[PDB]
């Protein structure tokens, strides 16, 4: 019954642009942050580890310093959105979205990057 979903399971983006990939999860009325965990991963790197209302930057891979953000206001709407700025060719590959809010689930997303 608790299910993480993906509007798009595939993204195709231009080199150098911005991108926001989305994982959705069910929220009824108001969202309690204490109960909520969000992970975004890419390959063996950690992009986002959101626990206790806070992103944990000491666990974050340094490749992603300055360019990666979980969009906080989108969370109330049951949408774990990951904004990555200045997209490079190395950003291409399979991403993972884990969300725990009572129950827990995860999904994968593929990002493809065209060069010019």
């Amino acid at each position: 019954a608790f299910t993480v979903t993906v509007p798009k399971d595939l993204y195709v983006v231009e080199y150098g642009s911005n991108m926001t990939i989305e994982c959705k999860f069910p929220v009824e009325k108001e969202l309690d942050l204490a109960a909520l965990i969000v992970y975004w991963e890419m390959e063996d790197k950690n992009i986002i580890q959101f626990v206790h209302g806070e992103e944990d930057l000491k666990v974050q891979h340094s490749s992603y310093r300055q360019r990666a953000r979980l969009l906080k206001d989108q969370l109330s709407l049951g949408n774990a959105a990951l904004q990555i700025t200045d997209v490079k060719l190395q950003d291409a590959g399979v991403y993972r979205c884990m969300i725990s809010y009572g129950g827990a689930d995860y999904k994968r997303i593929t990002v493809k990057v065209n060069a010019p």
Partner: antibody
Amino acid sequence: EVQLVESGGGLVQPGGSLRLSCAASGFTFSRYWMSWVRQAPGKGLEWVANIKQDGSEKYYVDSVKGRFTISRDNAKNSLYLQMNSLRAEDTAVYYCAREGGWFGELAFDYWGQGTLVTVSS
Amino acid sequence: IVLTQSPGTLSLSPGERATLSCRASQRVSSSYLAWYQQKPGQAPRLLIYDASSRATGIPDRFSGSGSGTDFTLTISRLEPEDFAVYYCQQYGSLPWTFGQGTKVEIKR
């Protein structure tokens, strides 16, 4: 030369407990998601449990949730299934499988040969 | 997510082409659909992943296609070694699930 070897199976009476183990070789075990899959005699294949590289996340089928516990030791190159409160429908060959790629996107890459678990009075 | 394989049994001569169906009750995310081969007394071998890619060392008479909820596995020009039970499996969405299998039997 990826290798997978299960151990620990046998006979156990209903309501009893048993611990399966799986040894890995030929690949970096700490880099991969690992699964258990079972098969009852004459039936088809059923996925059972899942564990993340660091043991930080675990998922189960409905039928074993609350009864089976999956766990792993990356140092020992080994995977474990602690089965408790066993019913007769848990009787099956139990396989360990590597989930290939980073997050399992290469499906079940490689399998052990399986070990038979028999649950009966 | 329920996978319904079809048909139950195929009776074919070596050299014939085999077509196996897998239908899903839901869309399979990213087309993460695997196929497997099992011979009696052995563990399954991976054939196809991501619906259309061959696993390593799998010969090219094994070919996958489909997308969404409808998936096909084709074995063109069957060899004697290809007669076995075939399984499809979805790994796009938890819980991972398997179809009930298809047996490809030598017709003599």
